[PDB]
Design a protein around this ligand. Structure first.
Ligand SMILES: O=C(NCc1nc(C2CC2)cs1)c1n[nH]c2ncccc12
Ligand SMILES: [Zn+2]
Ligand SMILES: [Zn+2]
Ligand SMILES: [Zn+2]
Length: 401
């Protein structure tokens, strides 16, 4: 983002009366009292969504989308220490930076000089990550992991949503899309920005989660077909359009539905023969003859960011805004019970290890190993926030035969 790009300044003229209408980023940064630009493009912001922290200023009340309000009542030299600590603990497992997301009216921008320092890009003094903080006590730099005791934010980034072309004030623009939400403005601001852009690097267990989801899907569907012998399966929303049980006898019919990022699909808009499979295809109410995996937006993980109108921004390779978890959607189904099924050729005791060996009295070692690995993946999937539901007649007792 060129520092010579124009900044629309009408939103600032109540806190800064008389501000020129003609204004570049270069001149605004100078006026803020200060890595080509502190400000970034929408595109760049989107690529670093994990780094977003709503920030509003209203003595001055500083509010962040973490829900914290600070009053700068204590002097700036202690307030800045709290800011560094809060951002480090919020972001250290999400991002190599911070992006302050503003609805800029002026005070938030003139207050930056009291807790921000800028300079060349640097590296942490204790590791190889880019530096995000600076300490005036030791004249050293640190990343979010090693910033304990550091008093200044270093080379933050920032983006003013009001530059995107909105009519009306923040609240009225936010409330058009979200009924769930200084800190309250910081939250609305980030929320509105997530809605505009969404309604990525490996930072955690992405790869184990995705392999576990693939394994569970194959297990549960294969077993549903064996136990109930459905003649046809309606696979709704498959992004890959690959059969998850390619050797099953059934007639596999695919129906295309992109991941709904706003409201859940209405089943009437989007089948009574056989079984319906919804693997992360979010509808308002699932038919009774369904196998379903639905992500619980309420779960706490480094992969799951707070979203708009109760949904969450699930970032796992790609960004997937997901509508709010609603228990009533599953009213025609029951929770899927854990089980492990295998027909592969053959000390574990388990009533839910459904294999020939266990049927005959004693689980062989191979199926003991595979059961324990499968349990591990299953638990990884549940902990990651996924929930599984199945048609009410599903009964693993039917697998023994
Ligand atoms: O489900 C998988 N990964 C977790 C994800 N969850 C989301 C959104 C919040 C719903 C996007 S990705 C997966 N990864 N490979 C697979 N193969 C077969 C079936 C599922 C998977
Ligand atoms: Zn470090
Ligand atoms: Zn909101
Ligand atoms: Zn066995």
């Amino acid at each position: 983002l060129s520092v010579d790009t124009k900044f629309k300044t009408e939103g600032l003229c109540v806190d800064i009366p008389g501000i020129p209408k003609d204004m570049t980023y270069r001149r605004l940064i100078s006026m803020m009292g200060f890595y080509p630009n502190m400000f970034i493009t929408r595109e760049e912001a989107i690529r670093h969504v994990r780094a977003w922290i709503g920030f509003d200023v209203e003595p001055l009340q500083l509010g962040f989308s973490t829900g914290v309000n600070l009053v700068a009542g204590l002097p700036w030299n202690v307030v800045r220490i709290k800011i560094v600590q809060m951002l480090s603990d919020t972001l250290k497992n999400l991002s190599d930076r911070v992006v302050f997301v503003l609805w800029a009216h002026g005070f938030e921008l003139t207050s930056m000089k009291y807790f921000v320092k800028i300079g060349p890009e640097r590296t942490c003094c204790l590791c190889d990550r880019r530096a995000t903080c600076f300490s005036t006590a030791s004249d050293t730099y640190a990343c979010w992991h090693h910033s304990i005791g550091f008093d200044y934010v270093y080379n933050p980034f920032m983006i003013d949503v009001q530059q995107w072309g909105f009519t009306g004030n923040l609240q009225s623009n936010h409330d058009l899309y979200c009924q769930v939400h200084a800190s309250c403005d910081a939250i609305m601001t980030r929320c509105l920005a997530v809605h505009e852009c969404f309604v990525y690097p490996i930072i955690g267990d992405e790869l184990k989660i995705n392999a576990a989801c693939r394994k569970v899907q194959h297990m549960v569907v294969k077993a549903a077909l064996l136990a109930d012998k459905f003649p046809v399966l309606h696979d709704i929303g498959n992004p890959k359009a690959i059969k998850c049980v390619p050797q099953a006898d059934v007639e596999w019919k695919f129906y295309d539905a992109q991941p709904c990022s706003d409201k859940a699909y209405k089943i009437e808009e989007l089948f009574t023969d056989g079984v319906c499979l919804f693997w992360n295809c979010n509808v308002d109410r699932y038919p009774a003859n369904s196998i379903v995996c639905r992500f619980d937006t309420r779960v706490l993980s480094n992969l799951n960011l707070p979203g708009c109108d109760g949904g969450s921004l699930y970032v796992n390779k790609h960004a997937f805004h997901t509508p709010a978890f609603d228990k009533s959607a599953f009213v025609n189904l029951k929770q899927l019970p854990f089980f492990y099924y295998s027909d592969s050729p053959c000390p574990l005791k388990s009533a839910t290890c459904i294999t020939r060996c266990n049927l005959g009295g004693a689980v062989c070692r191979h199926h003991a190993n595979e059961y324990r690995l499968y349990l591990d993946a299953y638990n990884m999937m549940i902990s990651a926030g996924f929930s599984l539901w199945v048609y009410k007649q599903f009964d693993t007792y039917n697998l023994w035969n």
